[PDB]
Write a protein that binds this ligand. Sequence first.
Ligand SMILES: O=P(O)(O)OC[C@H]1O[C@H](OP(=O)(O)OP(=O)(O)O)[C@H](O)[C@@H]1O
Ligand SMILES: O=P(O)(O)OC[C@H]1O[C@H](OP(=O)(O)OP(=O)(O)O)[C@H](O)[C@@H]1O
Ligand SMILES: O=P(O)(O)OC[C@H]1O[C@H](OP(=O)(O)OP(=O)(O)O)[C@H](O)[C@@H]1O
Ligand SMILES: O=P(O)(O)OC[C@H]1O[C@H](OP(=O)(O)OP(=O)(O)O)[C@H](O)[C@@H]1O
Ligand SMILES: O=P(O)(O)OC[C@H]1O[C@H](OP(=O)(O)OP(=O)(O)O)[C@H](O)[C@@H]1O
Ligand SMILES: O=P(O)(O)OC[C@H]1O[C@H](OP(=O)(O)OP(=O)(O)O)[C@H](O)[C@@H]1O
Lengths: 267, 267, 267, 267, 267, 267
Amino acid sequence: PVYEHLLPVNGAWRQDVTNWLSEDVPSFDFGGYVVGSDLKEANLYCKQDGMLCGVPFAQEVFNQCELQVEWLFKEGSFLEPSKNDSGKIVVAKITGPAKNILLAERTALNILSRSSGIATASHKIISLARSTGYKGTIAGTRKTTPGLRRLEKYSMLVGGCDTHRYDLSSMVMLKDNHIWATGSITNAVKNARAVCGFAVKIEVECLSEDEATEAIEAGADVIMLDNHFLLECSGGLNLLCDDIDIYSTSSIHQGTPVIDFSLKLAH
Amino acid sequence: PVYEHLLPVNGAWRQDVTNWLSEDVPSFDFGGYVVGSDLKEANLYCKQDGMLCGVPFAQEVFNQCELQVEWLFKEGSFLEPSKNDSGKIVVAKITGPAKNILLAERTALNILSRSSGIATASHKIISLARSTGYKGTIAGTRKTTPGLRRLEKYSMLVGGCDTHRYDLSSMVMLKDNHIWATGSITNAVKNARAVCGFAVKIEVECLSEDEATEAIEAGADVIMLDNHFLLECSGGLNLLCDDIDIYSTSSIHQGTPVIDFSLKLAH
Amino acid sequence: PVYEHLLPVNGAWRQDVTNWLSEDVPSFDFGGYVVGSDLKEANLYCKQDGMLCGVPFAQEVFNQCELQVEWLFKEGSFLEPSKNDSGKIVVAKITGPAKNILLAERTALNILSRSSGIATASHKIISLARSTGYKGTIAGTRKTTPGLRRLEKYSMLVGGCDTHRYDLSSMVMLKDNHIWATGSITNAVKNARAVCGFAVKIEVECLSEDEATEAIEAGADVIMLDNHFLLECSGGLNLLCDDIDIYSTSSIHQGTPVIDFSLKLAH
Amino acid sequence: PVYEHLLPVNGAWRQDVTNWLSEDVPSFDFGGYVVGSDLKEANLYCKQDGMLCGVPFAQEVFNQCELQVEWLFKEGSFLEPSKNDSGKIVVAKITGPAKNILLAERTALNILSRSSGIATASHKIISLARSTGYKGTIAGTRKTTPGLRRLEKYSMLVGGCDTHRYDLSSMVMLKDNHIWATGSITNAVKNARAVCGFAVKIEVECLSEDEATEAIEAGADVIMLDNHFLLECSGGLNLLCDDIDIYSTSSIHQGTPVIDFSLKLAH
Amino acid sequence: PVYEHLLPVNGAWRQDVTNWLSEDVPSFDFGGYVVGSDLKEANLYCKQDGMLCGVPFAQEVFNQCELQVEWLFKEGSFLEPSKNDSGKIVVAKITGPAKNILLAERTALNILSRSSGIATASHKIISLARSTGYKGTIAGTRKTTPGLRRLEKYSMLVGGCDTHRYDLSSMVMLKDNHIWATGSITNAVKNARAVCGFAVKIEVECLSEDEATEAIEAGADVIMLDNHFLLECSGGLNLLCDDIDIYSTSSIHQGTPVIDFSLKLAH
Amino acid sequence: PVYEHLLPVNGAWRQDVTNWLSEDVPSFDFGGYVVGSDLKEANLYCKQDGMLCGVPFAQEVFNQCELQVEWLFKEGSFLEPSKNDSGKIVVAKITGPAKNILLAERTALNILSRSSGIATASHKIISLARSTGYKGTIAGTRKTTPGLRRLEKYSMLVGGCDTHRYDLSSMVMLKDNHIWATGSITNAVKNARAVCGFAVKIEVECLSEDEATEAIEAGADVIMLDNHFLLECSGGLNLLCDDIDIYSTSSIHQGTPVIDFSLKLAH
Ligand SMILES: O=P(O)(O)OC[C@H]1O[C@H](OP(=O)(O)OP(=O)(O)O)[C@H](O)[C@@H]1O
Ligand SMILES: O=P(O)(O)OC[C@H]1O[C@H](OP(=O)(O)OP(=O)(O)O)[C@H](O)[C@@H]1O
Ligand SMILES: O=P(O)(O)OC[C@H]1O[C@H](OP(=O)(O)OP(=O)(O)O)[C@H](O)[C@@H]1O
Ligand SMILES: O=P(O)(O)OC[C@H]1O[C@H](OP(=O)(O)OP(=O)(O)O)[C@H](O)[C@@H]1O
Ligand SMILES: O=P(O)(O)OC[C@H]1O[C@H](OP(=O)(O)OP(=O)(O)O)[C@H](O)[C@@H]1O
Ligand SMILES: O=P(O)(O)OC[C@H]1O[C@H](OP(=O)(O)OP(=O)(O)O)[C@H](O)[C@@H]1O
């Protein structure tokens, strides 16, 4: 199994890459004009310790820029430019017209830095939860960067964490507002079930053992206790664990530090 | 002068908001079905100390969701839910069909959290540079989140920092690769000037007083010393200042923490 | 609960309507020129017995054409222009510039006819399965019309049938190809689980009680016997039932007859 | 002459295919992950008697999925998996990474089934009209599936039927509403002619020999009698013929049965 | 009859306007920031003698900029700021936030100038052909500005000229290449007819009375002699007329001078 | 340095070409059907004296049409089919399926004709200004054809002229409206500077030596006198020069004649 196989050979994500490029060049690329098209070589460097993530995305950036890339590491690999010999690590060798390389650069690096950042912070928490004996799941949230949801969720998976529900059409998530609207948890679940059906799970945010039970018996698939079936707890970060099912946290993705990368031509 | 006036009454950014919404609802919105359309009220809360940024963007999210919003604070205001009475601060009151509110929620909050995060980290560094007596500029970089460049740069401005060049068509940025390509700084500048013209500035990354001088005399508009005209230094973060012109740093935007926001219905 | 609440106040589906309109007018609308903009009245007729479906979609067609519509029946209602007095039934009254009405016409009718057709054929089979005592689900398939998936699935729901999985990112569906690839059902399920996680169900097409059992124990959520958990059988149409969980059929949607509608101006 | 030559080497239709794919994979393709990329072989089967239509479209689906296809039959060929040896007929052999094949599958089959269905029902009626001695035209209508007009009209042609006017910018179609608006048929035609010009035909729906004559003399190109030049009659289905010019019917396309296809990997 | 009724209330053309706006503001509108949103008044001036064309287009520019416009002249009117009192003529009064006005300006003026230019040059030639007694048609060509075809053809109509065929799907245009391909004019026409059908005209470029005759008898709708039915001659500009049917010229649209317009705020 | 290097290997401009093609073929290409796919040869001719411009654009048209092109002249070359031997000049040889050639034709020619027209008129004025001894710049304007800005500006550069500011986000352009809004030139400049920053120039339209001075001292980068820093004068065409900095004119691009091109197949 290879993570990049999650991405469809063709689909919207590739168009996203094209749009990211247009975002950087609205009219002309003056630098490309001065630099020209002589064939060049270049190395893509990792300058900080962390997991390598975002390969297929950066690869797509390089393909549309008509370059030849050779990846020295598999996506998911844990890089440690700990060696101060340089403090850097070549993760890919690139070849192509000078201008194409420089056009690609900033976009590919912006993808890798952030993708690697989410994967890394993801790995750290699942390695932490795992090191206590906990056998459950650590999930992310829907508090993703607008327009970048595909990439961030993907980065969560490579890091070893669950993604939780992708969107609002994905797994139903019921709360008080919904329960108050239908008059009861049981009613909220019945209506939710009537439209999502058997193929999609229903989750209910409960505030008491009585809340949960009613949900359980309405047929809810997941139960979130805050403040047959699975249980979830969510609210906080890298710090509560018990032999329960789900712990969600936006700390793995939202507002996380980045893993620094750089790209320089040979000579 | 009002920052939101930077955004064109109509243009691509509004389409970005629609796409951000579609990203959250690819097929149906089951929750909207259970909750229904009864008119509701809700408050948008700020749960952490920082500057409020992203108003026009979140406002656009609310407009497309056909809601009525009342903002209690001007964008740019420094919020301090320091008072533990609640640890929160209502920055806007919203009204509209229950489902519309819940559809809007996650997107608007994801905009505000990140926009406020960049503005805040931006304000902290310019307030810091300013507090030493430095009279120059603190700028950002092109290491922005793919697809979110408009919002992040905008957030930089509201925070009190320069944005630097928007893209590759914006201000010309010459380096060794370009200089090596044309044979000299003077040649790189001549070619750069020939295509960008008088309306757009040319910047050159120099590594010596001789490098700079030649650039100065080629006619470069900005000079970056690393490692008539303006001078720039860039590489590091919140820590070197001297009565010089430009200090760039991706720390104001890239991989920065977020300012937490929440939204809950009345009853 | 109102079905149309499944559609997000704003999102891609509304853009689909605009594209459907452009599809009918690539350059000019000569008829609109001759007819002009005088305000007119018109009735939307149902000419065949069946369930009314597609309201929010046709409504969106009418909104973009700047018209005023009054629906005489709730979506989901079973219409019977059985009365030969006319053999027709007015389901909506429309008002607006003559040209706008005529532009709207063909698109709205093409939506209603097909949407009503799927809903009707859907209602007939669930009413049939229900009339035998069967207490389970009748679902649809992914054999939908390219580009029209949102509308057809929506029509399935209004008719009283399940939609089954929306797409490939929705509920995992494993088969022999996958099982052969990983070496075993157990392995196929483990890999499927590793990437979809807890929020999304996994279904396995089994050909024996031993196939199923292994899937059950791998943790599959649904099992399809062809040729804790739920069971599914799929292959045929309006004709096998037993007190089991799921029966899927493309007969409810694919290649189904249409429910005839017409629209004429008053005088 | 080859029908597929009607499609421009590049244009919107290819983008439609990409959108149809995205429609099936909004976020990840879990199945593609489990199945992997090992090169595989597969056969595309026809399981029902009818005409093969939709080749260039399904071919485009296969090209974007980076596969190698070998078509065993020319588009337009009449297939008869009448032989119960299998009741199936291989119409194409495919090769490529397992996941790519499975991604392609449902979309290509949904194209073929419907395209073949329209072509078949089209061939049946023109073969029927032809078998009586009728030397005229059998046309379709604008009651096409929203967003799928290009494919359905194309399927009409391959089947041997006319498409009639593509859209509202295509051939002018005047009616009572228009005639009432301008005060007379003669006036409606004059205005229609003034904007469409010589390159585009004008058709008028007449209800009497006097209606027609005035249209004829206004210069209308086609006349529809319902209830130099050409005459048309339209309203009903597979059942009135006389040595006249045009008979239109939505029965050839709208709400027609589908021709079943399937695709399975080798081993 | 009003020309603007040719444009569909909604469709692609309105999106074109939005794209034209985005083209002018890729990131921020600094001027809008300095100018602010105070309500202002402004006049749209015509500075050269010619026909007013492009109203609905410029109106759409103004609507998306949320302004209030009052047109003092009907589209099609012949303006003569011949009076040197000012040499200008107010054709519309506008009101709205200062910034919105200034954003709109350049786009609306670029539409009007060119639209008015094509209409004017169109009127001049049809008034010229008409003044000799010629009772036929003066048409345009497909040599239109890429991406601006809708607007230019529309401008042709308002000027009093035919548009000729809109595109390649519009009226069939056969030539030697086609005739050589099928072996004969008769064959080229048969194949053309087989795919376009009765609703669309077929034109043939003939080089002899024998060429024409064969086309006539193949059933071609139009015949172009260069170098029942209609005849066409095309090649040259404002200068050959005889009581024949069609004279085409790109001089009415391609590379034509523009009609100068300006827009200034009140005080 | 090669001008075409200004265009990014991939970005929006290539999508513009696809849209230009779709604009010509909304449904089918009947001519392509009759002509077929036999491999053919063809020559692209220049029929009027002027500079060759638009190569990368026409090349992109040819690439998407899957053709093989051989350019006989470098973009920027001054062609003179002055020789009446033919009055034409082959600038490129093309090979590919007959239909693909004919599909490409009109679009590529419409690009070249206009691109060459702007370049030519651009070269004529800079050669004129240059021939007087003037050592400054001749610039264009923002009065470009809606949707075609990239191509026209690009054509300006190849011709030897400046493009001036690309858009409203490009170089700030202040006027009376802005100055009146902020109360003074000094204030308008301060606000403009506060949002555009150091990377983008600020220009001010001054009407007196006192106007200019205040702008100069506010820090404006350019000053336009109409009716350290650079000076500009703009208003008129091919006719005032003095040893000053900038002369802008829309005459180089807007409403300029076209350079005629043609394309014919070999035999
Ligand atoms: O961000 P974290 O603290 O990790 O918490 C993540 C949780 O937040 C969400 O609640 P919701 O979005 O409804 O309320 P919120 O916006 O106040 O977090 C949902 O409960 C997530 O699982
Ligand atoms: O991220 P920061 O450390 O604040 O530095 C920002 C600087 O980085 C950029 O260099 P470039 O992108 O060419 O090299 P890099 O990728 O190694 O930083 C450019 O020099 C920016 O001003
Ligand atoms: O169309 P129906 O006969 O109702 O059957 C529907 C079933 O078809 C599908 O199988 P798949 O698509 O893998 O094989 P197919 O194409 O041969 O039906 C899947 O099994 C559906 O549940
Ligand atoms: O669907 P069919 O019965 O084959 O008829 C097709 C005819 O329908 C159309 O009329 P129009 O769409 O104006 O009226 P309608 O919607 O009542 O058919 C037009 O007359 C078509 O040629
Ligand atoms: O531009 P004008 O001189 O008015 O001529 C217009 C004519 O040009 C076209 O021929 P085609 O485009 O096939 O050959 P061309 O490119 O050489 O004009 C077609 O014949 C037009 O009616
Ligand atoms: O078209 P030209 O005469 O060459 O002049 C070009 C000048 O026009 C513009 O003014 P603006 O657009 O503000 O006023 P206008 O529309 O009246 O020209 C700006 O001043 C340009 O540099």
